[PDB]
Amino acid sequence: KVVATDAYVTRTNIFYHASSSRLLAVGHPYFSIKRANKTVVPKVSGYQYRVFKVVLPDPNKFALPDSSLFDPTTQRLVWACTGLEVGRGQPLGVGVSGHPFLNKYDDVENSGSGGNPGQDNRVNVGMDYKQTQLCMVGCAPPLGEHWGKGKQCTNTPVQAGDCPPLELITSVIQDGDMVDTGFGAMNFADLQTNKSDVPIDICGTTCKYPDYLQMAADPYGDRLFFFLRKEQMFARHFFNRAGEVGEPVPDTLIIKGSGNRTSVGSSIYVNTPSGSLVSSEAQLFNKPYWLQKAQGHNNGICWGNQLFVTVVDTTRSTNMTLCASVTTSSTYTNSDYKEYMRHVEEYDLQFIFQLCSITLSAEVVAYIHTMNPSVLEDWNFPDPYKNLSFWEVNLKEKFSSELDQYPLGRKFLLQS
Amino acid sequence: KVVATDAYVTRTNIFYHASSSRLLAVGHPYFSIKRANKTVVPKVSGYQYRVFKVVLPDPNKFALPDSSLFDPTTQRLVWACTGLEVGRGQPLGVGVSGHPFLNKYDDVENSGSGGNPGQDNRVNVGMDYKQTQLCMVGCAPPLGEHWGKGKQCTNTPVQAGDCPPLELITSVIQDGDMVDTGFGAMNFADLQTNKSDVPIDICGTTCKYPDYLQMAADPYGDRLFFFLRKEQMFARHFFNRAGEVGEPVPDTLIIKGSGNRTSVGSSIYVNTPSGSLVSSEAQLFNKPYWLQKAQGHNNGICWGNQLFVTVVDTTRSTNMTLCASVTTSSTYTNSDYKEYMRHVEEYDLQFIFQLCSITLSAEVVAYIHTMNPSVLEDWNFPDPYKNLSFWEVNLKEKFSSELDQYPLGRKFLLQS
Amino acid sequence: KVVATDAYVTRTNIFYHASSSRLLAVGHPYFSIKRANKTVVPKVSGYQYRVFKVVLPDPNKFALPDSSLFDPTTQRLVWACTGLEVGRGQPLGVGVSGHPFLNKYDDVENSGSGGNPGQDNRVNVGMDYKQTQLCMVGCAPPLGEHWGKGKQCTNTPVQAGDCPPLELITSVIQDGDMVDTGFGAMNFADLQTNKSDVPIDICGTTCKYPDYLQMAADPYGDRLFFFLRKEQMFARHFFNRAGEVGEPVPDTLIIKGSGNRTSVGSSIYVNTPSGSLVSSEAQLFNKPYWLQKAQGHNNGICWGNQLFVTVVDTTRSTNMTLCASVTTSSTYTNSDYKEYMRHVEEYDLQFIFQLCSITLSAEVVAYIHTMNPSVLEDWNFPDPYKNLSFWEVNLKEKFSSELDQYPLGRKFLLQS
Amino acid sequence: KVVATDAYVTRTNIFYHASSSRLLAVGHPYFSIKRANKTVVPKVSGYQYRVFKVVLPDPNKFALPDSSLFDPTTQRLVWACTGLEVGRGQPLGVGVSGHPFLNKYDDVENSGSGGNPGQDNRVNVGMDYKQTQLCMVGCAPPLGEHWGKGKQCTNTPVQAGDCPPLELITSVIQDGDMVDTGFGAMNFADLQTNKSDVPIDICGTTCKYPDYLQMAADPYGDRLFFFLRKEQMFARHFFNRAGEVGEPVPDTLIIKGSGNRTSVGSSIYVNTPSGSLVSSEAQLFNKPYWLQKAQGHNNGICWGNQLFVTVVDTTRSTNMTLCASVTTSSTYTNSDYKEYMRHVEEYDLQFIFQLCSITLSAEVVAYIHTMNPSVLEDWNFPDPYKNLSFWEVNLKEKFSSELDQYPLGRKFLLQS
């Protein structure tokens, strides 16, 4: 029913280079400030899904150097991705997170022994998240999972704020989506009501993880080409949350009684993860990548002149601290100064592409129509993607066949 | 007496794919909650054995594409296991256990408090277990052991809370059993009467270990095909337990005298194990496997027309925090906030199988009858395991010969 | 003077397998308890040298499958070691020890207290050792060296608690000996009098190390066939030793002055070792080994018709907690619970030997007489070992000519 | 437009050795001390860039041992750098910095103490940096990115203490600059107003990280021949910052109320980077480095008769503490003792160089004139960098062809 793409497509001996030049993202690492609903400084963090929608030149109307090979009848031209390059330029740095109002009341390890200060309140606490190093390339945007509060419970329950059902919501991973965490990839804006169980960056958003199961389980494999993953975490401190337990522990396991007791502690225990050491040797970027054979039936074919590259990197997530003076004084005064958190994130996207052709037969037309008809009216023989927000890059009028003028071209001519 | 399975079976070049699709397991990570004497939410944790009884159709009545090679007389068909994929889909995360009342008398790491305890010194303390990865595959379910209260003491001794005898008790691992921590493989319900010397998750239960010796010591090798384990742990903090010691240290080894002393301290020394860091490179799942050579005399042949695969993993076993609001107020009170734990765990079972035949001879009949006669009534030429609670999964009517439509089939054709 | 074995031995193509079956050991880790002066429970710990003394069948009187190769005149045949496997099966776990009264004066990581102690500034302190793995094999037991007090010092001195002389006492090893920690191979029963500077499990006796630079210097190589060892060692806490300093620091290096000073504090600085993590790639266990070419002049020769295998591994040596009820009360009380420390330890020895023969010339007879005459009266062409305590194990009448029924046999016949 | 150097140049079989001998540097590592407004002790630190201008003799003016290959007409001779060696000679040591008056508000990790800050809450803090090994070489001075204050604020704003426009500035690296640490490559002297939020060594100066992206995207790659980096870092503490928050947290994300609140805690969260372990396999120095194919189109051709090397090696950068006695007394009084604090670093620069000829064709002359006019008036067929502070080293009249009498030369002749 479904056949590999290389059975019908044809690879030519034509290679072009594209470069995104300098890409910069500067903004506050925790929340997007806006004065009179005008976001001057948006959300910019090293803990952010970077989804780049690359638009491509039409190979059919492009100034092809050898138009003799091309035939307007029964032959169309598409771009095929060959090599990729993600140019990080910022130095190494671990991001810092936290929240001033969090439920950090007992230190179970008893080195600190916080002892749950009196009355229901909060306290300031901060930590770092895990080392996450992920990159994805594809002709379709990635799909990732997260659990959340979906449909209500079975039958007709009567309750007031009990445990909701858990549903595996699978959503397209767009720019503005929050990375996985050691606290679980939930919809904390809705599922969590305190807005105080996690640091400020993830309390009002929806963390989600790429569900590789459905990702690879696609019949056509349009949603992936190849994935690179490195993850590192280890729990550095153990603690509990306050509040009451709606699912109490049975008495059959715990013996209670006597003074200084008969009130059980919280059965809710979580941790603070840490990434430990970063290194340049463990880096997966600033190095050429070659697409020998994709796992799915899509050997780098960019249908519809659209490309999707998503990266998350924590090695370049260092948080910048700024200070300024309102006034000045003879002595050091706390009132004269204002403090700001600014984050930067630098990107280069460098690509080498190979020209691809196709011969139109009746079964070929039927297959290419069944898998996607939108491209079929594109070649002219309501995209839902306009609603979602991505980081768009335009690589039109930037393709160059003079690949020897670029370092990626040199590395490409090094091997074949 | 015992001959290799390769002597009599015949391997044919017919291969079939199986996929159990999106398998889910959501439940409370510490204990199985009971509401109205029924398991509304069962206990699901990453610290728990996952025992997968996968059932397969009858090849004798299966609609084979080529039945001409088959003979209804002196030939039967049975699948042979060829390739495994256990598709965990979780973000890599570590879980937390603990006890609100554990025998945590005093930390002893650098300094010690006064010797003799008071009435009740049993405090809130949490921890995490050792880092475990384990996969077992075979046709017969594994047997594992734990240290338990065996038969009563020899001769006729009279006792009152004396030390019970230790017995290496052997039982088949069923689903619901939980993985060995850094504490020790034993029965906490029987051999421990405190119920306050271990975190609450395994305080009432038993944790067991695979007997790779007696797996190997079996004559036919039906209890394994291959096994992979990766285990790491280091001790973090040391402490002592309250209560008197049944075996005081001899006076020939210690000198007592005067005040603040002549009262022996706690001789109990127990640790806080930790799983250290986790990395994607040390992960031993989510990668294709090939059965080249079984150590025993069962090269993937699924006797009984079924297969047993058991996995444990803690790298993808983060805990999940769930809060709702019973009420609300103008200010912040946890009286308006109710708390829960949940844990999710997902699996794909991507299997590839080889079709095989047998030349049924008289000596072959005798040998196959001696190793297991149950299959001899099965081909038609009282299971005690029905009492045991497994994780049954059905892959009948889900096989396919068109292996190119599946991700594992591409790797299968990639090699050989 | 001493010639290699390979000149005169004759290796036939005959291989045998022996199985030691399930060997178990239970006992208290710190001291052997004695009730009415009998060993009710032996001292069993994971920090104990395991010296398995394997007795072998008489090969000349053994029932050979083909005895026509052998000639009773001018020829004798003995066993030859080829492949040994140590089947551990305990879950991975670190042993934690300590001393209920340890001479711990002050912490010196970051801050020091007053240097002058009181009458007894001694506290319960618990700690772990290094992690060690040691395996060696041979036909004679190894020699452990340790520094100790031997004869009197030089001249004829009269002294009151002066420093005893240090002698490198080399004694034969035995089962139940203590492994070396970071504190060194020390005869604590003699040179140490406090009995309060080192934890319980090794304070009452002497620990030893193998003399590799004597065994290599031995002309025979009888004790060693090969050895594999791993040591991991890192210091976590530093501390000072209370008590009077028998060697006061010279005034040339230290300038004293003013109040709360001019009295030299504790000038002794010893550390707390630890073994850090235990990783599943770091054991020398549960994997076969092939004797290719021994370093010594004994190519697996079972001289004396006996075998000596010495192993120790603290990686699978966690301590087991035992708590029992004496009465039943409504609340939790300390006096209603009895506590015990019990440790378990299991082994299986998988052996495969080669059948080797000797041509008996007069030069050969004289040479082997110079090697070990006891075997010469054994063939009939006062052992001091009976005084010491070895783990005697009988492998007689357990042989097997076939190797296809044993996993060690399969792993052997996979190669060559 | 631009072609590779190896297309037109011709290589000869002549090699010459260059040795910088002992290059020593001693100086105060935090700031240069000045008396009478002169730099008696320059600021010399292990976290400072080492930028060496290697000056070379003219091959055109050199007295060649073989001038037969030379032709004064249409042929100019230039040096070509082939082999590199940075001879460090210091024992390994961690660099340490700190600051006596830093806005170390509150240690926040294990718990927090939210209180109203006073006028001053600064405390002395000690801190290490990220561990960094880096060598850059070429014929053009390498640059680096650093963040700073760009143009004035957009629109027509009136403000007193707002966040300034933060802009990337590309600045060429000179000697005396400091390597980036965990706090970010930027100008603290202008943008950090307190002069107190970092250690004093990086308060009034600017650390800047070299931009590999402009070493790649340049049309010639003159700034870089080949580069080595190895950088490791991990966090050890978390703390917030004193002073007002000029960008307050949004109200819809944080719930606040009741007593002890309506005065928010410090939302600024930062960290303590550290270099972790430094090992003897970690150094990418004290070893020969051979050029075979530079990434750009400049294969070791040092244009302008000059050589550029910039290194940072913080691994062996332990700090110097020196004692002296202004006076003396009977007892230890601090006023008798004065302390100075320094830093020492040593370098050798072992080079092997190669000669290349070139045919001065008219199109080649035009290509080099577009490449560089300075070499055109150099050969005789206004450096802007004279203002900058460099480390000039004179390798003129030091070359030799007796490579057997030198270490690196015999490494070179050991193969090819």
CA-based max dimension of chain A = 94
Are residues A56 and A383 in contact, defined by beta-carbon separation less than 8 angstroms? no
* Chain B contact present for D258, CB below 8 A: yes
Task: Tell me how the structure was determined.
Answer: cryo-EM
Task: Considering only the beta carbons, identify the residue of D111, D130, D166 that sits closest to A112.
Answer: D111
Q: How many CB atoms lie within 10 A of CB C290?
A: 12
Smallest CA–CA distance, residue D146 to chain B, in Å, is 33
DSSP C368: H
Cα A335 off chain centre by: 39
Are residues B254 and C101 in contact, defined by beta-carbon separation less than 8 angstroms? yes
Element (H or E) spanning C9, and its range?
A: strand C9-19
Comparing C-alpha atoms, which of A273, A313, A282, A286 is closest to residue A49?
Answer: A313
Q: B: neighbours with 3+ CB pairs under 8 Å?
A: A, C, D
Give CA–CA dist B327/B338, Å, rounded.
Answer: 9
Helix (H, G, I), strand (E, B) or coil at A4: coil
Residue B386 structure tokens = 């029905």
Long-range contacts of C196-199 (CB under 8 A, 24+ apart): C196/B254, C196/B255, C196/C99, C196/C101, C196/C102, C196/C103, C196/C122, C197/C102, C197/C103, C197/C241, C198/C99, C199/C97, C199/C98, C199/C99, C199/C102, C199/C126, C199/C127
| Amino acid letter for position B329 | S
Give CA–CA dist A119/A130, Å, rounded.
Answer: 32
Contacts of A253 in chain C (CB under 8 A): none
DSSP A260: T
| Amino acid letter for position C264 | V
Residue A279 structure tokens = 């290194």
Give CA–CA dist B127/B130, Å, rounded.
Answer: 10
Q: How many CB atoms lie within 10 A of CB A331?
A: 7
Q: C: neighbours with 3+ CB pairs under 8 Å?
A: A, B, D
* Chain A contact present for B238, CB below 8 A: no
Contact between D254 and A200 using a beta-carbon 8 Å cutoff: yes
Give CA–CA dist B102/C143, Å, rounded.
Answer: 45
Give CA–CA dist D294/D304, Å, rounded.
Answer: 18
Give CA–CA dist C87/C311, Å, rounded.
Answer: 12
Rounded to the nearest 5 percent, the helix, strand and coil shares of chain A are 10, 35, 55
Please list the residues that pair with A334 across neighbouring strands: none
Residue A350 structure tokens = 């460098």
* Chain C contact present for A258, CB below 8 A: yes
Contact between A337 and D261 using a beta-carbon 8 Å cutoff: no
Q: Which residue has the tokens 């957009």?
A: D154
Q: How many CB atoms lie within 10 A of CB B130?
A: 23
Contact between A28 and D111 using a beta-carbon 8 Å cutoff: no
Give CA–CA dist D81/D289, Å, rounded.
Answer: 11
Task: Considering only the beta carbons, identify the residue of C107, C277, C324 that sits closest to B161.
Answer: C324
* Chain D contact present for B334, CB below 8 A: no
* Chain A contact present for B36, CB below 8 A: no
- Radius of gyration, CA atoms only, chain B: 26
Query: Is the torsion defined by CA of C186, C188, C190, C193 positive or negative?
Result: positive
Query: Is the torsion defined by CA of D251, D257, D263, D264 positive or negative?
Result: negative
Give CA–CA dist C24/B166, Å, rounded.
Answer: 11
Smallest CA–CA distance, residue C124 to chain B, in Å, is 6
DSSP C162: P
Comparing C-alpha atoms, which of D376, D208, D399, D297 is closest to residue D1?
Answer: D297
Q: Which residue has the tokens 């019973």?
A: B326
Q: How many CB atoms lie within 10 A of CB A285?
A: 19
Element (H or E) spanning B191, and its range?
A: helix B188-191
Strand pairing class (D23-26; D344-347): antiparallel
Comparing C-alpha atoms, which of A328, A255, A300 is closest to residue A82?
Answer: A300
Distance spanning both ends of chain B, measured CA to CA: 34
Helix (H, G, I), strand (E, B) or coil at B75: coil
> Best interface-test mutation with A: which of D108, D111, D228 has the largest number of A CBs within 10 A?
D111
Smallest CA–CA distance, residue A255 to chain D, in Å, is 30
Give CA–CA dist C260/C265, Å, rounded.
Answer: 11
Smallest CA–CA distance, residue A71 to chain D, in Å, is 32
Strand pairing class (B338-347; A244-245): parallel
Resolution of this structure in Å: 4.3
HEC string of chain D equals CCCCHHHCCEEEEEEEEEECCCEEEECECCCCEEECCEEEECECCCCECEEEEEECCCCCCCCCCCCCCCCCCCEEEEEEEEEECECCCCCCECCCEEEEEECEEEECCCCCCCCCCCCCCCEEEEECCCEEEEEEEECCCCEEEEEEECCCCCCCCCCCCCCCCEEEEEEECCCCCECCCCCCCEEHHHHCCCCCCCCHHHCCCEECECCHHHHHCCCCCCCCCCEEEEEEEEEEEEEEECCEECCCCCCCCCCCCCCCCCCCCCCCEEEEEECCCCCCCCCCCCCCEECCCCCCCCCCECHHHEEEEEEEECCECCCEEEEEECCCCCCCCHHHEEEEEECEEEECEEEEEEEEEEECCHHHHHHHHHHCHHHHHHHCCCCHHHCCCCEEEECCCCCECCHHHCHHHHHHHHCC
Give CA–CA dist A10/A21, Å, rounded.
Answer: 30
Are residues A87 and A113 in contact, defined by beta-carbon separation less than 8 angstroms? no
Are residues C229 and C135 in contact, defined by beta-carbon separation less than 8 angstroms? yes
Distances (CA, A) of C63 to A264, C292, C300, C356, C378: 70, 27, 22, 15, 18
Give CA–CA dist A249/A269, Å, rounded.
Answer: 13
Cα C416 off chain centre by: 34
Smallest CA–CA distance, residue D330 to chain C, in Å, is 8
Contacts of D260 in chain B (CB under 8 A): none
Are residues B142 and B310 in contact, defined by beta-carbon separation less than 8 angstroms? yes
Q: How many CB atoms lie within 10 A of CB B252?
A: 9
Contacts of D332 in chain C (CB under 8 A): 255-258, 261
Contact between B100 and A254 using a beta-carbon 8 Å cutoff: yes
Are residues D57 and D63 in contact, defined by beta-carbon separation less than 8 angstroms? no
Q: How many CB pairs under 8 A join B and C?
A: 221
Give CA–CA dist A408/A289, Å, rounded.
Answer: 10
Smallest CA–CA distance, residue B119 to chain C, in Å, is 6
Give CA–CA dist A209/A226, Å, rounded.
Answer: 16
Give CA–CA dist A199/A104, Å, rounded.
Answer: 11
Cα A35 off chain centre by: 28
What lies within 8 Å, CB to CB, of A40 at 6+ separation is A33, A34
Q: A: neighbours with 3+ CB pairs under 8 Å?
A: B, C, D
| Amino acid letter for position D327 | T
Give CA–CA dist C412/D326, Å, rounded.
Answer: 78
- Specify whether the backbone of B47 is left (phi greater than 0), alpha (psi in -120 to 50) or beta: alpha
Distances (CA, A) of C235 to A414, B137, B394, C238, C277: 49, 41, 53, 8, 13
Are residues A193 and A103 in contact, defined by beta-carbon separation less than 8 angstroms? no
Q: How many CB atoms lie within 10 A of CB D93?
A: 15
CA-based max dimension of chain B = 94
Distances (CA, A) of B49 to B31, B94, D136: 14, 16, 53
In terms of Cβ atoms closer than 10 Å to its own Cβ (0-12, 13-18, 19+), residue A95 is buried
Helix (H, G, I), strand (E, B) or coil at B100: strand
Beta strands (DSSP E) in B302-398 are 306-313, 320-324, 338-347, 350-358, 391-394
Distances (CA, A) of C131 to C107, C238, C282: 24, 19, 11
Residue A400 structure tokens = 């160059």
Contacts of D331 in chain C (CB under 8 A): 256-258
Residue A318 structure tokens = 């260092």
Residue C374 structure tokens = 């006891």
Strand pairing class (D350-359; D10-19): antiparallel
Element (H or E) spanning A409, and its range?
A: helix A407-414
